[PDB]
Design a protein around this ligand. Sequence first.
Ligand code: G4P
Ligand code: G4P
Ligand code: MG
Lengths: 483, 482
Amino acid sequence: AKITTVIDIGSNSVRLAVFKKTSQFGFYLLFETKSKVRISEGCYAFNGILQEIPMQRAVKALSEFKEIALKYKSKKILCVATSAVRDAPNRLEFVARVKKACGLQIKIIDGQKEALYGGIACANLLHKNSGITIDIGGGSTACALIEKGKIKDLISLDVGTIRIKEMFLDKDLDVKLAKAFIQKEVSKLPFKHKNAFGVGGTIRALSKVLMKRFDYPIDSLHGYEIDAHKNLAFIEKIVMLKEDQLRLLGVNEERLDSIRSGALILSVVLEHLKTSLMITSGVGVREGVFLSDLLRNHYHKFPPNINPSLISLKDRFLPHEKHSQKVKKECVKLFEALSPLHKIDEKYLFHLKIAGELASMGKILSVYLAHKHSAYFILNALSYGFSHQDRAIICLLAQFSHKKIPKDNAIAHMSAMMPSLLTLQWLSFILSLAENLCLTDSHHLKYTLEKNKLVIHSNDALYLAKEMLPKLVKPIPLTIEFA
Amino acid sequence: KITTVIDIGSNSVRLAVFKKTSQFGFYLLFETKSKVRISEGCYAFNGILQEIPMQRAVKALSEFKEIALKYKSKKILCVATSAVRDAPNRLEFVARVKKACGLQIKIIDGQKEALYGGIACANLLHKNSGITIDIGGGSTACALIEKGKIKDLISLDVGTIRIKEMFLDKDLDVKLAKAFIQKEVSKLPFKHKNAFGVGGTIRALSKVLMKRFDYPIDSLHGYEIDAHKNLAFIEKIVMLKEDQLRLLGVNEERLDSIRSGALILSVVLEHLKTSLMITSGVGVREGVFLSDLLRNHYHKFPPNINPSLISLKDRFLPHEKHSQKVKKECVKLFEALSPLHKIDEKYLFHLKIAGELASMGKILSVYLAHKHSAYFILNALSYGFSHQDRAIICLLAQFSHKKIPKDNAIAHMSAMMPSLLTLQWLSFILSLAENLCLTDSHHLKYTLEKNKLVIHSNDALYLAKEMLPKLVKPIPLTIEFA
Ligand SMILES: Nc1nc2c(ncn2[C@@H]2O[C@H](COP(=O)(O)OP(=O)(O)O)[C@@H](OP(=O)(O)OP(=O)(O)O)[C@H]2O)c(=O)[nH]1
Ligand SMILES: Nc1nc2c(ncn2[C@@H]2O[C@H](COP(=O)(O)OP(=O)(O)O)[C@@H](OP(=O)(O)OP(=O)(O)O)[C@H]2O)c(=O)[nH]1
Ligand SMILES: [Mg+2]
């Protein structure tokens, strides 16, 4: 199925995602939208029976979601329901009510499945292979233990923002009564880990709060790293704030009644799991349901050296991948020939190779400032499987091709673990020289290094490359000659 | 599908690869150059082509052939200009090229060269009438355009490299070159308030003016220059030393030719009584292509066709259904609300294009999709649009469902830009149009009852109703569904 729509009927909101499959492993999120139905509204005081008005709202919203799915020419519609519907004595009635109204066939999924799908997404679409997911929802909280890309255990707890809200916070009971309740369920988590994968809207909201609190330069939620110990106190503080204080931190109006109880869950879980680093995730159950279908024969895992966002990016903007692969190859050969001089850690080949593939991607938009554009595409769309540093490095190499990288760059200094300015100049220089030598259809290039002289061997004239040699920015005094 | 054009100029050899994405849709896929300068030292020998510049030219064009093939060109159009057409050994140099790489150079005369420039400026600029100024290495072409149709063609024998090696390399008084250029410019039989600057010299000078004023948009095409106001500065360029030119941003390879070129421009501008010069990023190369693409259309695009807008949609909006609906509702809401915002009907032009392209950037990422859209618009919506057009459309898309900041740089890029309250109105209308078009609902009808917009429809419009609070209204305004 080329175009696949995924509908997620949660306890707090109703969400829709349209996925487009560009190649075997290539895909990208084509369209997203939401509705704040909150089908669980007022149900926790009546044994989880879905009330009449929320069901009417859910039907009206799900009917237009079906319309949206069809105008995108969807070949497959996967619809799932979670905690609030799971627990509802009248779940069958609501499922059949939706089918009669718009045709959608809701598939109620158990709390373990809900946890599994989240783990599948994080294990394939994040830049770390080991850790525990934390998917705080309206009615339940899921956790999936992941070790080296494989899911080793799963837990589902019956604590949730709207559940805690309607049980304790709307009755204005002391928070310690709501805190105790959550701890009693969190104790049922049989694992610990230094890493955490933050999943769900509540955590995306708290992630935005911190991104604002630290003036983060990169405006991408997926991959955002959060020191758990340093911010644990700040997260608990959010619980006791009034509505006006939450607005000043950036919390949307529609999250004001739920984020307080949400922060409380997250703070109790972070303490129990002994987390020290939480990575914000932008994917969850929705993406998991899709990946479970996409990677049916590959054990729900991507083959090694297969990144979905890198591939789909080339599928969308580089259908003719021939030129970009030669540039990448020459980047490796030069990196090796020059290794005695630059002594750069081999780990940056990863970033240099990708920069070579994508250096000219931006030409699809304009040949002028093309590298600027490619750097723009990279920083904003190269998400799955890359850290924010990985984007920054890859971004800068392409951006400053044939140019000198300034010393006051905001992105280059986003962290102390970033490579030196000399390393970036070295890498970008290599990229630049490679682009010049691949301008023609030259083959069998060989490079040799002497004390300080790079010698380029080839049977071709390489007239243009030779003419363009002055306009390269060298990292150090260096001589370049053509045999 | 893919057409390459090779321009054998007097100062440089140029290669451009064009991709045709539809009937009228095209975009420049790749470009490069070589500084062969085949005319080096030719003006002393009545135009004879020297050996070294010919061997360099052969080597370069042979690799321009290699490039054209690896881009899968079905057509390779090659033209030669002044320096090559004035030589006594033209036929021989053309033979060595065809021998060495298989290219068939077509020598074109001055009239033909002015035409190709006029064809490009007549189709790819945001003004319909004016005079082109194509200052090259050995000639200066001028075409008269009236309502997009070419009326007269003239070719002058003044050029950068020419004026350089005849006057400026010999360290004589500048007034001698000005007199020579004046006597040759007098041949121009027309005048006009609009001039279209073409060629690398003028692009280099425009780049200098942009830096001087700290311009916020980094696109050359469509840059407007006040001729009277900037004439004196252009004249001063002539008397500057190279180190002074470097601080102005002039690259090394233009240092030897920008002074003579500046002098030519100051005389042409003065003689044509030019009031507005529009920098053109397109020239002879684009004319050759448009001549082949618009062969059955009298070398001009229909007066409803923008090849930039189109190509931008061919590249990123193959399925055009949703966008056309949003545009339609943008017009209806605009007219229905006119008693409240009282905005000049000329701004419908922008709101409609913003409505077509508001969601374009979703092909890069659904997150921050509207910003991506603005980025595309501001950097690639070039042919047939002014910079203000770009700026306005860019801002409408960018700040959908948002409040436009008061200190926005693009909003203040000019004093003629619309007010912030106007931009807020258009952005708000776009936003409402987007919500009402989310589903496939039809037959929307609007009525205004003293600040009350009433949206009439038979469909539930559930989602549109729920999203209403997230709109940023430009003024206190009531909106209700019937
Ligand atoms: N799943 C997911 N969502 C993302 C990601 N990045 C951003 N979003 C969400 O998409 C919506 C758009 O936020 P922006 O990207 O800043 O675009 P916008 O503000 O101009 O509307 C927001 O949801 P919202 O309107 O604040 O409501 P909510 O969905 O956050 O509860 C935002 O939190 C991501 O990586 N993954
Ligand atoms: N024909 C045309 N050219 C444009 C246009 N816009 C920019 N250019 C030229 O393209 C080349 C790329 O310079 P930039 O656009 O700044 O991109 P870059 O700095 O990263 O190389 C420059 O030519 P250059 O390297 O300075 O040498 P030259 O070709 O200008 O003489 C620039 O003047 C345009 O609209 N039309
Ligand atoms: Mg959920």
